[PDB]
Amino acid sequence: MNADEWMTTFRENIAQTWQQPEHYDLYIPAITWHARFAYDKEKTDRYNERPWGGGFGLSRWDEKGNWHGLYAMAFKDSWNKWEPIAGYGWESTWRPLADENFHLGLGFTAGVTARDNWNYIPLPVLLPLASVGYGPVTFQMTYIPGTYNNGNVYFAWMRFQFLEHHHHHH
Structure with missing residues (x-):
């Protein structure tokens, strides 16, 4: 709300997101x-x-x-x-x-x-995938090519971006 309060609030979210990569x-x-x-x-x-x-x-x-x-x-x-x-x-x-x-x-x-x-x-195994989403909505796609009939399937799964997800304590 305040002048410096609003800054530290944003700087903390932007600095933590740029300093702590990998989600x-x-x-x-x-x-x-x-x-x-x-x-x-x-x-x-x-x-x-x-x-x-x-x-x-x-x-x-x-x-x-x-x-x-x-x-x-x-x-x-x-x-x-x-x-x-x-x-x-x-x-x-x-x-x-x-x-x-x-x-x-x-x-x-x-x-x-x-x-x-x-x-x-x-x-190991080779499998082509794709990434399509926005914000908290991540769509995971994966197809498996082959010949024509037995080689053209598509997969769809849900994906969410979180941190730790084990404990906070603070």
Whole structure:
């Protein structure tokens, strides 16, 4: 409200956002497309309940118009099993004129699925993704090309930008 009070208030938010980069991102299931489109009647005769997982990760920017893409999440199976995922690649995000928060672009990230075993050891995988959103609304897109019918699916998940998300105390 005051003169110096209004300054320190803004300077604190702008200085903390520029001094403390890298934000804690988190994603979760929302809506996905189907490629098979077949009448599932083999392993779905009755209503089945499957567990879910938590999505997380961070991102970076390069002065050379580069967008670092890093993923970090873990899924739980019905028979107890944590599946750690880690992405690493580059993405090209375009910025508007007047606006700034609103970003739209695409890229390629390689996710690595770890697994404890003497055969199913952690192996990397190539999967193209995209980033489109604005403010607290982040849209995560991911397609899987192939041939024509079995290679043209799209994925959609929710994404939120938070910090720490573990504890404050202060």
